[PDB]
Design a protein around this ligand. Structure first.
Ligand SMILES: C#CCCCSC[C@H]1CN(Cc2c[nH]c3c(N)ncnc23)C[C@@H]1O
Ligand SMILES: C#CCCCSC[C@H]1CN(Cc2c[nH]c3c(N)ncnc23)C[C@@H]1O
Ligand SMILES: C#CCCCSC[C@H]1CN(Cc2c[nH]c3c(N)ncnc23)C[C@@H]1O
Ligand SMILES: [Cl-]
Lengths: 274, 274, 274
């Protein structure tokens, strides 16, 4: 019943403006600098959406240099209640095949260079000390809709998974890939952290459609990851994320989020000492 | 017999000037910038002490932004032989209950943004390349006095423990919390590193009174950590750290430290190539 | 048959200009700043070499402050086909004794402060987004020649090993040392990452002669590492790295590298989106 507005952050090979009807481009500024690119405002059926290319529409910005703060701030300022993203990733598990979707529910941070809070003491818009809880980083209700929708579409989709986010831009060594497996990581990328953290500070329902593109390099005997391999797999499978977003978003718009959003707002508010 | 002077760095909820008699405020400057707040000079029985609030007296400075270099430099310059600190922490072990003290003896670094040496090539006050040993990061003699004193006070106190120090300011994910358990971490915080490292470079006997405030989030079925929960536990248990400091410090002042301090000075001196 | 030119980066205690005949000093500038010190141009038998002291010839630059980008860029610009380095390290395995050489084949990154790519968006000389593969970070053909040569010299030499590279400049805690063992690390240093990563981006055959100098601190009951201990072990064993380089380099110059170099060039080229 109450209004939703869905932010969509498109990842590698997975950032297609044609998903939205009635599109208008809008460049914005934020207190944390410029977002990766213009916001694309539009609709999926009756639902207002805001699309943003994580790496810029020409994929010019490497993961370490993405302005996660500006991206999330921009989407919050536009009125987004939800941020649903796409992310390419490596599979660290035999059962997660290239082309599979994983509706991730946890992460392990391996990043090093990245601001992870709006509350850095330098911005009048975000005053105080903020310690956000990360026990449940992703919105379970949004994830549930994604999982059910993937099933209705007949897609190979894993209902949970732990993403290890590496700094990059290099891929992992084999020793690192083996190690991440022992830590219980299921998939590997370069962008989930701090995007998920900042969304939680913003009181936004965040979920991630991870698409496996390769098996990283933990099969010593088999093909290891490369840029060409990742891009080829995405070319083959991008349609699945598009269909999943197109079908999921109207279902989100048809249910009631006020309580979910209130609880997230309170968790965020009570994490700050002003 | 020989003179000691005890630096006290107060952590979250645990930075109370009333612990000292004959108090005088003194703001100082250092070659690494300003300390978190004024030094509070005073006494516990006959022993000279110097108190400093890690996060500022109004808790305005998040862990990533604490000027660990300036804090330790300021205390060294004031003549501190010892630095005994308090730190709130999460428990990663069932037997470490909220309200328990842990006299930690090891750490695992998960920080990323932090200068860990005075010897960065930029300061004429700290010339050369310094590689400090960290096999035994905390002073065992100071820890021993803390442990015995806690026993005399009847406090629930663990005689050792490994602190994992995360960058923050977010709390850990559940996947991270589980992972740290597999690494052998016992408690979790955001401030031990690089404070302990810089104290060792300074040739100061350093020890830490860690106070468990929560169980982080590794019980999937139970209450996870939040700011409100941490602050509530500290309100309930702060008196214990205060009593432990009040009772420990006179005992430190009543024994002989010249040899201990000489050995630390030599370890620090011989870590530097000028 | 086709020409090779060997860059040599000398590590701690292991950066000796006397290894080259017909020496000439050449200071250079790069788009990433100045290298650690002058390039020393010279020969080993008929083979052109370029020597560079990682830490400066007076060991004035700590690992975190080494300009890995400028060093690798400088060697590439001088025409190096190969970069063979020396690195002191701690042993995390009983069978790797101090004085042993380890021809490492993998790494685990524990660094936090370091640029790991030339492609940072800020340099016109390195345009685009680059994601370099790290499955096999070290050149197996160069490693093979090192291993066979060490055998011909009768040296204690391990044919593979995983290096964990820590940020430093502090040494590891005991809890960290134990943890790295569980991760499958064999040796520990502060310099392999990002040196190896940048060499791969440059399309250079990179290999590392690691020399164990200590057992870090994982024997709770035995001597732990210190600067004095490291430097003493290197004084005793430096001749071995020198002899290994002197004997290996002519063998490299006597075989054909065009295909190996072509494959590395293509891997690097196809990692970049322009
Ligand atoms: C150059 C260029 C265009 C991008 C080519 S593929 C690299 C992107 C895909 N993205 C996710 C990813 C897929 N497979 C991975 C892997 N195996 N490790 C880490 N990240 C990934 C990382 C990076 O942003
Ligand atoms: C906002 C505000 C005031 C501080 C509220 S609690 C957060 C502080 C407590 N401190 C220690 C701590 C307690 N429980 C923890 C946990 N579970 N993980 C990491 N650190 C902690 C971290 C941070 O400096
Ligand atoms: C001060 C000074 C001169 C250097 C003294 S020894 C420290 C260098 C040796 N280098 C390698 C190393 C040897 N043993 C190690 C250990 N146990 N841990 C990490 N690194 C090392 C680290 C650093 O660059
Ligand atoms: Cl780590």
């Amino acid at each position: 019943t109450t209004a939703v507005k869905i932010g969509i952050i498109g990842g590698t090979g997975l950032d297609d403006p044609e998903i939205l009807e009635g599109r208008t481009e809008k460049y914005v500024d934020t207190p944390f600098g410029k977002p990766s690119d213009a916001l694309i405002l539009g609709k999926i059926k009756n639902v207002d959406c805001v699309l943003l290319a994580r790496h810029g529409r020409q994929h010019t910005i490497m993961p370490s240099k993405v302005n996660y703060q500006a991206n999330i701030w921009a989407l919050k300022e536009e009125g987004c209640t939800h941020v649903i993203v796409t992310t390419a990733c490596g599979s660290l598990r035999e059962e997660i095949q290239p082309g599979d979707i994983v509706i991730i529910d946890q992460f392990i941070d391996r990043t090093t260079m990245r601001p992870q809070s709006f509350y850095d003491g330098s911005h009048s818009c975000a005053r105080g000390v903020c310690h956000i809880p990360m026990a449940e980083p992703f919105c379970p209700k949004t994830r549930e809709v994604l999982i059910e929708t993937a099933k209705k579409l007949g897609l190979r989709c894993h209902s949970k998974g732990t993403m290890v986010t590496i700094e990059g831009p290099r891929f992992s060594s084999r020793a690192e890939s083996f190690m991440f497996r022992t830590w219980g990581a299921d998939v590997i990328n370069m962008t989930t952290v701090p995007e998920v953290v900042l969304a939680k500070e913003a009181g936004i329902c965040y979920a991630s459609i991870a698409m496996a593109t390769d098996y990283d390099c933990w099969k010593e005997h088999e093909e290891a990851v490369s840029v060409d391999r990742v891009l080829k797999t995405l070319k083959e499978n991008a349609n699945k994320a598009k269909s999943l977003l197109l079908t999921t978003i109207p279902q989100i718009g048809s249910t009631e989020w006020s309580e979910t959003l209130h609880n997230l707002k309170n968790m965020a508010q009570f994490s700050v000492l002003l």
